[PDB]
Design an enzyme around this catalytic site. Structure first.
Site: not given
Lengths: 233, 202, 244, 220, 248, 238, 233, 244
Positions: B1-2, B170
């Site tokens: 997750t970014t 990600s």
């Protein structure tokens, strides 16, 4: 019809003033404060000779050093005395000492105007206690006598009379009492005034006498030792 | 997750990846992490999928009712404060890392960061999530003060592409969002549209 | 008997010997205490609201004095009666509209918003502890499936859909005016529905009012967003009326 | 357990197996996993079987209460928000993995709800034990805007892939096709597994079991 | 708040509860209900007030309610308040069965509900239940029993009693014919019809206007049944022929 | 006539009779005088006795080291508000360590007494209090009524026949600011003497004095402690 | 801030009648007429839907309301009080389905609804409902019809009429109603009983009718009402 | 307009003509109290309240009818001072809760709406009585500018350029009509506010009064402050000289 916490145009609550009127129908009680003790006298008022005179108790001990005389509605009084007995033991548990006569009277005086309809607990009071009380005991300040009424106004008294013939007995106490009298004179004077206000003649199984002195604990006069002061009519 | 949000003169530029993993398996490679709260206010979600979505819907309900009572366009600071009150009070129960960025007629472009703790701070640029750790060096070196809208779109796209390259959590698709006085415009960068970076080989 | 009383049937919300609720009937007279009249007309393209805007003295800020309220971006209403009770029903309507979108996902319809307020006002009718609200709400808004919707709720708890409605002191007189316009076949457009609403408030009250004396709010198909016309747009409709 | 959903040109096709296991032993060979929500929305179930049934029935009960008050067909987003908020409040203690799919006024909507309370809107989703085997079929053969028969074949192959490769799934393939006008609830769409019939019966002869005490009670 | 209060749980100058006595007046308007005890069984007999041409008739009984496996009751007063009380009686009977694993004794179930009815008359500020109940049952302690209930929470075990319309005239009529410790169920059913026929507004007596239920122990099991119209018709005709045989 | 039963019921004139009847309770109790200077605040109170055999009633009660009160009205309502004033002062010393300012405490009474005057079945506190306190702003004399409305006064007297005391304080109001401690108290008793008829004057048994300020903490003088204040009195002005 | 009354408003009169219930029964008598007929093949419910202004939208608010897939309601008297009874009937029907997994019997739902109606005649600070209810249903291959009044009593009917002139309706019903009528014949005799007390021509918007059978309860569309109304079938 | 037996005893009871008299009698309580004025200028708001001196013994500053709700919000009260202080505490808490949740100073239009809802909540029940006081609210900022609101015992809030509540509210409003408060600076307003109270004050019915004034504008940087001894006495000198 109105609420219980309603003020009069005069400037006082109705339910409290009617509770004062309830005492005037009750039995008379005389208490005298002496330099060597506090004596309490009350009439039993026996309706029928079939009823046991020993059952009628209007003077009860709160602690070993404090006695209490009650007038008016006896049923409501026993709730106040029971609460006073717990408060003395709660203070004993926490502070390891006996309460002063003024403090015990103040504890009962806190339950004065704790009656109401709305904003109260499910098992709360709806009416004031129609009881006049005489707190007589000995502490570190000496022998003390206190008077309490339904309003919760407590005050120290040298000689106080409460009951049916409250006005007649008080006037008799005003002309006899002085500062330097003895305990034997205090018991004697109380009995002579007690027979004057009674409808039925004074007898050994008709009265209650209790003395609290700096020497010994709370003492209840038995039939035998009652007749020792009755013989001096 | 970014997740990323960069502030410019007109408004804000947003950016988020598309990968959500439940261990080492991708549950959704098309996840839209840019959640709309109001007409000009957006937030970026990172952490627990169940926790972040529940708070985002709760703020939308709170700010929506709040904006009508005052009869006034909602502030970005107001929207970020509602996220702050939920993330701080239930900090031992929720796993959330929300970045709130939007526009209001009073202040303009604003970027706020609400991390794991529950604190709130305004920044010129903000990065969050698991893949954000790998791009701390790039963002600090590339960022210029007073960048235009078009430059911020490229700045967010490049930083996200480098993060998805290294991070396993990600990946997938870059989702961008630009907010100004005109409104909200979103674009989706696909496979070959991704910013190209060379792999060093002998 | 026709007009009989027994016990406390006129003090609390309980039944009379006939089966009538007096306290509820007095609440309708509380609507007429404001001295204002609201008229609502539904067209094929828009829903229109028009109400008196009484400013008795220059001391009052004219912009703050309003009976037009916004509940949702698509749903608006007008209040008639006690202003203290009116605002309380609006704040509750705003709560129910937001709670619907949070729990059910989609935006609340005008049909369901009026039904919800009617159910809340029913509690006042059955319980003796509180008096019913002395106000009337007329909701407008476009359902994305059926079209323009006009609804009105009573202090009694009655709610219904309408083609045209009225509320206030001049309610029973203005409702008769709408009946004559509906009976004849009309091409209900944006300009047609607005002009019919203004003339209704202008013929019954007989004033021929200025743009600052009335407030208009419309919801059209192309713009489902609730919008107030203000003095700049209201005057444009008024000068066009004195033509035919 | 293998449950899957797909979105095609007209509506939604939902798939499920019929194997229910207690530990590593099959308890039920024929078990319904596609559940009724509304006359337009259906939901597949996975995880804890007791939690799956009661969570579904409660939302189906609330939406019937919701549709009759509104007077119109319930929305898929309404079913989603009810499942999302209720599962979140219990912090994943209610083990309910659901695939929501129904035809709305807006159109076809497919959701996947996790026991913790997270929802994902996708054209295709897979949940359960054999979800990884079922997704592999979708990631290889799926294409946007498919025909009804083409969509039915894709899901059936996805469920079957979870049936043979995963030990937690088996038996029959159940399909639920929902469109704008037609609702097909094919209970036994495909039966790939068959028990080898008992060629040598061991039927107990009458009076082979020893009896100690017998009592007969007549009935009305 | 106190101005609108009706003051239900308050004593009167004469030392009686008004709301209870007014609820007693409500039962006196309701249908005639009587129950009598016999040696081999026990029965209830009630006047059906719901009489119309277009009534559907779905339930087994109108005023006779089954509470337990070994017990049944009848109703005199308001039908709505009775449905709440009879439902409570079914709950108390099941609470005893859950706790002790044996059927509740007749006296214990009557006293349990009467404690609840007494509570409404003492505290709560609510109206008391205007329902008088007649209980019939069997237990292993005393056997066949009959009980009468009052709105005040007052109960009494009877051998022959009546409550409802013309209750004072019916109880004196039951005092005339009843024989202590010698009455059988066959003679009891004939006595019940005799009283109901005389103490009624509309005489002649038809099968639709009356409702009779019997409780008899058979083969170590309690049997509770509501007598069908054809069974009731025979009991009326047996008394109808007795009316003709009297003139001789 | 029918509006004088509850606090919730408003009079057609725009009044609440139950609050007005509660104010009559203060007028029935004996008068007490409260005055201040620049460094001290003194409370002088007159005691009542139901009988000559009974002792005199307590009129001055402790609240804190810097705050004290003198009551007028119901005894039980006086002690109930006194316990509230004691508790609020204890909470401030527990939390902030500093003594709670007088202006703050009087505002807390105005918040508590307001509650029952608005609710049904509740009654106003039928007691009037004169509060003497010293903080980092100087001496304070505060007057509280059965109504939540409170007064910040330079000199005040409330109770039975307190109008005669109120007239004396008004003519000597400018003198108080520059008064000596011994002189300040003497002004208090001379005001309290005006309430009593010409038949009787002040004695050691019916006079209580409470002094608080910069020099010393709040202290109550009763019988033998009140006699240095009474000695050197100006003769009775009939 | 609020509290709530705990005392009952419905009390017994010196005569022995409950005053508030009898007035609530007077409220239902002054309402729109409503008819319900059981046909052993299906159930039919019809009510007067007079709008008396034209301006009102007829299709917006319905008097005939469904509770579940097989149960519906028709009323007389007050509108607002009926709506609360609908929501309560709908919720009680769903509570049964969540526990027993079986469509609620009609006889069982009426018992639960009447129990709620009984509460408001005894609970603190509330008035009874001014609504009488007609409940229809289909279960066990049998049609059902019930009537529940303000008091809380419930009666099973073959055919009955409510609202204004209910005495004229039932007398016309006992003259026309016959056992073993067809569902289509049941609608015809139900739409004729409403004509007995109506005045001012019947249109598809003037009345509302709902049917219940083995297929389930549903409200008849204005197109279906149109065909059953034009004098002939 | 007077009902004796019933209808006027409870706040939860409607009258036959559709009015709540318990609210109206609370409005009669504010009519018996002295006048309180507040005029909005071009760059702020100025308040002015006449305080009737009951006894000469009370300190100057006692029974203050000017309160600080927030650091930017002022409060001028009229009616019963007991209820005025309680509504001040609720207003202070409402302003405190807004800053704790959102982090910025509460707008006056939102603060006036939230407090009026609390005022209204006391007018529907028998358990509680309506507040027997009316109050004013005023604030100034950079974005919102000068704002003034007034809330009455019923719970109605409106915007004002110049409002008055008390004994002679009608006589005071006629004096503000002559003023040009749209163009005037708040320094000139203090001078004019002081002289209105002196004209309004009835010195043959009432004894003597004490003047109290308050700032809230650009002069005091947005913060609601009390008027200094220099400016107050300078405006008080003009008040006595213009009277001649």
């Amino acid at each position: 019809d109105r609420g219980v916490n309603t003020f009069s145009p005069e400037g006082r609550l109705f339910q409290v003033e009617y509770a004062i009127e309830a005492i005037k129908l009750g039995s008379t009680a005389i208490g005298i404060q002496t330099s060597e003790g506090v004596c309490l006298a009350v009439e039993k008022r026996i309706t029928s000779p079939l009823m046991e005179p020993s059952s009628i108790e209007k003077i009860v001990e709160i602690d070993a050093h404090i006695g209490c005389a009650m007038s008016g509605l006896i049923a409501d009084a026993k709730t106040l005395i029971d609460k006073a007995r717990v408060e003395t033991q709660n203070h004993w548990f926490t502070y390891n000492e006996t309460m002063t006569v003024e403090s015990v009277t103040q504890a009962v005086s806190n339950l004065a105007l704790q009656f109401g309809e709305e904003d109260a607990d499910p098992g709360a009071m709806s009416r004031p206690f129609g009881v006049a009380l005489l707190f007589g005991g000995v502490d570190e300040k000496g022998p003390q006598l206190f008077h309490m009424d339904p309003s919760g106004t407590f005050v120290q008294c040298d000689a106080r009379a409460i009951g049916s013939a409250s006005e007649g007995a008080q006037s008799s106490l005003q002309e006899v009492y002085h500062k330097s009298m003895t305990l034997k004179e205090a018991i004697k004077s109380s009995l002579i005034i007690l027979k004057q206000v009674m409808e039925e003649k004074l007898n050994a199984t008709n009265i209650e006498l209790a003395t609290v002195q700096p020497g010994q604990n709370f003492h209840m006069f038995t039939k035998e030792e009652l007749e020792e002061v009755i013989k001096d009519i | 997750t970014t997740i990323m949000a960069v502030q410019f003169n007109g408004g804000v530029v947003l950016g988020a990846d598309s990968r959500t993993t439940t261990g080492s398996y991708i549950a959704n490679r098309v996840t839209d992490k840019l959640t709309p709260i109001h007409d000009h206010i957006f937030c970026c979600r990172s952490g627990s999928a169940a926790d972040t979505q529940a708070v985002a819907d709760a703020v939308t309900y709170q700010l929506g009712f709040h904006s009508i009572e005052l009869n006034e366009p909602p502030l970005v600071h107001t929207a970020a404060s509602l996220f702050k009150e939920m993330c701080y009070r239930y900090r031992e129960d929720l796993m959330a890392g929300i970045i709130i960025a939007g526009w209001d007629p009073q202040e303009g472009g604003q970027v706020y960061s609400v991390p794991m703790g529950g604190m709130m701070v305004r920044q010129s640029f903000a990065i969050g999530g698991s893949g954000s750790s790998y791009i701390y060096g790039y963002v600090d070196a590339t960022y210029r003060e007073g960048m235009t809208k078009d430059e911020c779109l490229q700045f967010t796209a490049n930083a996200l592409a480098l993060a998805m390259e290294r991070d396993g959590s990600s990946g997938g698709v870059i989702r961008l969002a630009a907010i100004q006085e005109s409104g909200v415009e979103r674009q989706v960068l696909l496979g070959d549209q991704i910013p190209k970076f060379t792999i060093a080989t002998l | 008997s026709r007009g009989s009383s027994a016990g406390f049937d006129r003090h609390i919300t309980i039944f009379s010997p006939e089966g009538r609720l007096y306290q509820v009937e007095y609440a309708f007279k509380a609507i007429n205490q404001g001295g204002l009249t609201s008229v609502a007309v539904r067209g094929k393209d828009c829903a229109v609201i028009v109400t008196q805007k009484k400013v008795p003295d220059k001391l009052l800020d004219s912009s703050t004095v309003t009976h037009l309220f916004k509940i949702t971006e698509s749903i608006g209403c007008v209040m008639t009666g006690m202003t203290a009770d009116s605002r309380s029903q609006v704040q509750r309507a705003r709560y129910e509209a937001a709670n619907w979108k949070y729990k059910y996902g989609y935006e609340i319809p005008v049909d369901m918003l009026c039904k919800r307020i009617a159910d809340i006002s029913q509690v006042y009718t059955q319980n003796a502890e509180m008096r019913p609200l002395g106000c009337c709400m007329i909701l407008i808004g476009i359902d994305e499936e059926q079209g323009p919707q006009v609804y009105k709720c009573d202090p009694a708890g009655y709610y219904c859909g309408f083609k045209a409605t009225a509320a206030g002191v001049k309610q029973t007189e203005s409702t008769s005016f709408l009946e004559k316009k509906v009976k004849k076949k009309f091409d209900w457009t944006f300009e047609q529905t607005v002009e019919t609403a203004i003339t209704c408030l202008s013929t019954v009250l007989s004033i021929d009012f200025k743009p600052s004396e009335i407030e208009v709010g419309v919801v059209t198909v192309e713009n489902p967003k609730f919008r107030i016309l203000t003095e700049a747009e209201i005057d444009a409709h008024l000068v066009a009326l004195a033509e035919r | 357990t293998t449950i899957a959903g797909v979105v095609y040109k007209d509506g939604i096709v939902l798939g499920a197996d019929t194997r229910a296991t207690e530990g590593m032993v099959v308890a039920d060979k024929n078990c319904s996993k596609i559940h009724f929500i509304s006359p337009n929305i259906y939901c597949c179930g996975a995880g804890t079987a007791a939690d799956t049934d009661m969570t579904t029935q409660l939302i189906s009960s609330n939406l019937e209460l919701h549709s009759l008050t509104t007077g119109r067909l319930p929305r898929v987003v309404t079913a989603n928000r009810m499942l999302k908020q209720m599962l979140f409040r219990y912090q994943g203690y209610i083990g309910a993995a659901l695939v929501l799919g129904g035809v709305d006024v807006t159109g076809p909507h497919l959701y996947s709800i996790y026991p913790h309370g997270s929802t994902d809107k996708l054209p295709y989703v897979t949940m359960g034990s054999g979800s990884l085997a079922a997704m592999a079929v979708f990631e290889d053969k799926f294409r946007p805007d498919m025909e009804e028969e083409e969509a039915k074949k894709l899901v059936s192959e996805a469920i079957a892939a979870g049936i043979f490769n995963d030990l937690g799934s088996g038996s029959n393939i159940d399909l639920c096709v929902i469109s704008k006008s037609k609702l097909d609830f094919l209970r036994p769409f495909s039966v790939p597994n068959k028990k080898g019939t008992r060629l040598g019966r061991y039927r107990c002869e009458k009076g082979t079991t020893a009896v100690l005490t017998e009592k007969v009670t007549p009935l009305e | 708040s106190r101005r609108y209060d009706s003051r239900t749980t308050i004593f009167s100058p004469e030392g009686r509860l008004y709301q209870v006595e007014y609820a007693m007046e409500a039962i006196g308007h309701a249908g005639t209900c009587l129950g009598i005890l016999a040696n081999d069984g026990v029965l209830l007999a009630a006047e059906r007030r719901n009489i119309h041409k277009l009534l559907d008739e779905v339930f087994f009984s109108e005023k006779i309610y089954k509470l337990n496996e070994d017990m049944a009751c009848s109703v005199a007063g308001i039908t709505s308040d009775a449905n709440v009380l009879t439902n409570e009686l079914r709950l108390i009977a099941q609470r005893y069965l859950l706790q002790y694993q044996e059927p509740i004794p007749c006296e214990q179930l009557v006293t349990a509900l009467c404690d609840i009815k007494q509570a409404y008359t003492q505290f709560g500020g609510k109206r008391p239940f205007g329902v008088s109940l007649l209980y019939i049952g069997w237990d292993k302690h005393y056997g066949f029993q009959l009980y009468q209930s009052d709105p005040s929470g007052n109960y009494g075990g009877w051998k022959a009693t009546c409550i409802g319309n013309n209750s004072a005239a019916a109880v004196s009529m039951l005092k005339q014919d009843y024989k202590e410790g010698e009455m059988t169920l066959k003679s009891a059913l004939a006595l019940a019809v005799k009283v109901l026929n005389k103490t009624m507004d509309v005489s002649k007596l038809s099968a639709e206007k009356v409702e009779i239920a019997t409780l008899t122990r058979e083969s170590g099991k309690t049997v509770i049944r509501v007598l069908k119209q054809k069974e009731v018709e025979q009991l009326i005709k047996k008394h109808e022929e007795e009316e003709a045989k009297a003139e001789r | 006539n029918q509006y004088d039963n509850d606090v919730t019921v408003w009079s057609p004139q725009g009044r609440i009779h139950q609050i007005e009847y509660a104010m009559e309770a203060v007028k029935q109790g004996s008068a007490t005088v409260g005055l201040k200077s620049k460094t001290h605040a003194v409370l002088v109170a007159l005691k009542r006795a139901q009988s000559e055999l009974a002792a005199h009633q307590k009129k001055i009660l402790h609240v804190d080291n810097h705050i004290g009160i003198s009551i007028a009205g119901l005894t039980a309502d006086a002690r109930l508000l006194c316990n509230f004033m004691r508790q609020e002062c204890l909470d401030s010393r527990f939390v902030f360590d500093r003594p709670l300012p007088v202006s703050r405490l009087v505002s807390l009474i105005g918040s508590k007494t307001q509650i029952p005057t608005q609710r049904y079945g509740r009654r106003p506190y039928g007691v009037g209090l004169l509060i003497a306190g010293y903080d980092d702003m100087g001496p304070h004399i505060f007057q509280t009524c059965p109504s939540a409305n409170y007064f910040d006064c330079r000199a005040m007297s409330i109770g039975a026949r307190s109008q005669s005391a109120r007239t004396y304080l008004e003519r000597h109001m400018s003198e108080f600011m520059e008064c000596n401690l011994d002189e300040l108290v003497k002004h208090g008793l001379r005001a309290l003497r005006e309430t009593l008829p010409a038949e009787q004057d002040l004695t050691t048994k019916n006079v209580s004095i409470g002094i608080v300020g910069k020099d010393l903490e709040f202290t109550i003088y009763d019988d033998d402690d009140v006699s240095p204040f009474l000695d050197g009195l100006e003769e009775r002005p009939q | 801030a609020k509290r709530g009354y705990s005392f009952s408003l419905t009390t017994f009169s010196p005569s022995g009648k409950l005053v508030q219930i009898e007035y609530a029964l007077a409220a239902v008598a002054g309402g729109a007429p409503s008819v319900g007929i059981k046909a052993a093949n299906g159930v039919v419910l019809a009510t007067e839907k007079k709008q008396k202004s034209i301006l009102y939208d007829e299709r917006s608010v319905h008097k005939v309301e469904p509770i579940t897939k097989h149960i519906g309601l028709v009323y007389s008297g007050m509108g607002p009080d009926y709506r609360v009874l609908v929501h309560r009937a709908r919720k009680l029907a769903q509570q049964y389905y969540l526990v027993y997994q079986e469509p609620i019997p009609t006889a069982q739902l009426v018992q639960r609804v009447a129990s709620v109606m009984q509460e408001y005649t005894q609970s603190g600070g509330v008035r009874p409902f001014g609504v009488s209810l007609l409940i229809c249903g289909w279960n066990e291959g049998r049609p059902y019809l019930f009537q529940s009044d303000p008091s809380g009593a419930y009666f099973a009917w073959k055919a009955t009429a409510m609202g204004k002139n209910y005495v004229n309706g039932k007398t016309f019903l006992e003259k026309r109603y016959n056992e073993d009528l067809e569902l289509e014949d049941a609608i015809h005799t139900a739409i004729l009983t409403l004509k007995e007390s109506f005045e001012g021509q019947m249109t598809e918007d003037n009345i509302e009718v709902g049917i219940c059978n083995e297929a389930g309860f549903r409200r008849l569309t204005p197109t279906e009402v149109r065909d059953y109304l034009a004098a002939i079938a | 307009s007077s009902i004796g037996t019933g209808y006027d005893l409870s706040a939860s009871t409607f009258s036959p003509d559709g009015r709540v008299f318990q609210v109206e009698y609370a409005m009669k309580a504010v009519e018996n109290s002295s006048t309180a004025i507040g005029i909005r200028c071009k760059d702020g708001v100025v308040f002015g309240v006449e305080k009737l001196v009951l006894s000469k013994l009370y300190e100057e500053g006692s029974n203050k009818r000017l309160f600080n709700v927030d650091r930017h919000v002022g409060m001028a009260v009229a009616g019963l001072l007991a209820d005025a202080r309680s509504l001040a505490d609720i207003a202070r808490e409402e302003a405190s809760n807004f800053r704790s949740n959102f982090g910025y100073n509460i707008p006056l239009k939102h603060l006036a709406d939230r407090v009026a809802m609390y005022v209204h909540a006391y007018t529907l029940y028998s358990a509680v009585r309506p507040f027997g006081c009316s109050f004013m609210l005023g604030s100034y900022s950079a974005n919102d500018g000068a704002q003034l609101y007034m809330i009455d015992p019923s719970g109605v809030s409106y915007g004002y350029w110049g409002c008055a509540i008390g004994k002679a509210r009608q006589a005071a409003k006629t004096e503000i009509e002559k003023l040009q408060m749209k163009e005037m600076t708040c320094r000139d307003v203090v001078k004019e506010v002081a002289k209105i109270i002196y004209i309004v004050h009835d010195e043959v019915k009432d004894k003597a009064f004490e003047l109290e004034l308050s700032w809230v504008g650009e002069l005091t940087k947005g913060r609601h402050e009390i008027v200094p001894k220099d400016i107050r006495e300078e405006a008080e000198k003009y008040a006595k000289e213009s009277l001649k």
